[PDB]
């Protein structure tokens, strides 16, 4: 089974998390409670640039988000039939990416900065994320993204949508294709479970797993 | 049946690792050079940016924003993106360790200038300390002249732009790692990137204060 290091929390591993459960794979969290877990890890030497996210699979240690991200989608056949869709496909789970690092900072940020930045993610959503990705539906007409089959973009999609909800449940409101996506894919049986109570899916960041973030990687 | 043509302004900003790549390759490229924030609005009005941003390429008769999905499938085109899928993953790991460097040093001049001088030391002790041992280690784990599969990938044309731009900004930096020195040397004596470092390449000098303000005009920030 693969094995994730990370702390208890979304963070950096929670689109591993989606992705791996999507594609039906059973894996195992090492949760990281303090700066000593992270300084052992770092120490026996699993770690190459001394930073988690690190997810041990097919035995070898792999850090680096996207390099995880990147070797699962391959691995189990979501990354897109050929080099143009991969292209595609890496296209849309970038702005996602994009749209996605925005939402992360949104808690430590600086508290003064705090009302900007919201307001700014969320005209973002508006004007320039959503309308792109109901663009792309409402081209081809299809149940999913990219060459009609299940990809990764569609379960980062789907799993950005998640976070843009609990943000403000108006922002999908004008997007028709967007929440039928979020519904289709919210139904496919490995996601259906994902999003089950008591599942490894992880709640929104709160203050107390914020300072737990701060003591862990020293910030 | 079109060389690729790159879309952006002037300067190295986020296009300039796409410009190493296919010039390592042997893929003679255009660029149309964005001048202003019309220019720029021109491109989203035509509808050629999904997201209303560059990096923009045209090549193989499709437009590609986000330069990460640029990079990989100009890697992968021309067999720069390892032999397997556990190479690739060596790969994206070296290259994102590249990529979170380069952006610290690329962000060094929009820092509020009371940061400036803080930031900068920072970015030395994780130069050395975190980022060119964790690459001496790979080159030294092997001995072999190339990153990843003994043979040449784009890891080795992203690391050795960025010992470039440390070199720019500290030539002291890569003193105590002879194989980066080494990796270094090579890669730059390839006949394709030999033909790049020479002068009047499409390579792009450092962004001085005159071009960061072309790029708050044309990007509106
Ligand atoms: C907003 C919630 C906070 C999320 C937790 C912080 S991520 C922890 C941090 N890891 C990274 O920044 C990895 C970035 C890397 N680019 C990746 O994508 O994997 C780390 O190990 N830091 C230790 C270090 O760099 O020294
Ligand atoms: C230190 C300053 C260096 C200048 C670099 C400017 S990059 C310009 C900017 N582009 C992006 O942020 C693209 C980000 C995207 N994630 C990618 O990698 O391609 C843009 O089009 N912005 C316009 C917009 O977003 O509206």
Same mark, same amino acid.
């Given at each position: 089974?693969?094995?994730?290091?990370? *702390?208890?929390?979304?963070?950096?591993?929670? #689109?591993?998390?989606?992705?791996?459960?999507?594609?039906?794979?059973? !894996?195992?969290?090492? !949760?990281?409670?303090?700066?000593?877990?992270?300084?052992?890890?770092?120490?026996?030497?699993?770690?190459? *640039?001394?930073?988690?996210?690190?997810?041990?699979?097919?035995?070898?240690?792999?850090?680096?988000?996207?390099?995880?991200?990147?070797?699962?989608?391959?691995?189990?056949?979501?990354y897109?039939?050929?080099?143009?869709?991969?292209?595609?496909?890496?296209?849309?789970?970038?702005?996602?990416?994009?749209?996605? &690092?925005?939402?992360?900072?949104?808690?430590?940020?600086?508290?003064? &900065?705090?009302? +900007?930045?919201?307001?700014?993610?969320?005209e973002?959503?508006?004007?320039?994320?959503?309308?792109? !990705?109901?663009?792309?539906?409402?081209?081809?007409?299809?149940?999913?993204? $990219?060459?009609?089959?299940?990809?990764? +973009?569609?379960?980062?999609? $789907? &799993?950005?949508?998640?976070?843009?909800?609990?943000?403000? #449940?108006?922002?999908?409101?004008? *997007?028709?294709?967007?929440?039928?996506?979020?519904?289709?894919?919210s139904?496919?049986?490995? $996601?259906?479970?994902?999003?089950?109570?008591? #599942?490894?899916?992880?709640?929104?960041?709160?203050?107390?797993?914020?300072?737990?973030?701060?003591?862990?990687?020293?910030?």
């Open positions: 089974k693969p094995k994730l290091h990370y *702390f208890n929390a979304r963070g950096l591993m929670e #689109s591993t998390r989606w992705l791996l459960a999507a594609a039906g794979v059973e !894996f195992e969290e090492k !949760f990281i409670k303090s700066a000593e877990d992270l300084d052992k890890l770092r120490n026996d030497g699993y770690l190459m *640039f001394q930073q988690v996210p690190m997810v041990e699979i097919d035995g070898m240690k792999l850090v680096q988000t996207r390099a995880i991200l990147n070797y699962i989608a391959s691995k189990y056949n979501l897109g039939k050929d080099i143009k869709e991969r292209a595609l496909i890496d296209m849309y789970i970038e702005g996602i990416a994009d749209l996605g &690092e925005m939402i992360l900072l949104l808690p430590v940020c600086p508290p003064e &900065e705090k009302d +900007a930045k919201l307001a700014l993610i969320k973002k959503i508006k004007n320039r994320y959503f309308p792109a !990705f109901e663009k792309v539906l409402k081209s081809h007409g299809q149940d999913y993204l $990219v060459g009609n089959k299940l990809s990764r +973009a569609d379960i980062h999609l $789907v &799993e950005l949508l998640y976070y843009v909800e609990e943000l403000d #449940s108006s922002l999908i409101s004008s *997007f028709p294709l967007l929440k039928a996506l979020k519904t289709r894919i139904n496919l049986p490995t $996601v259906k479970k994902f999003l089950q109570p008591g #599942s490894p899916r992880k709640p929104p960041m709160d203050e107390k797993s914020l300072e737990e973030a701060r003591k862990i990687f020293r910030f």
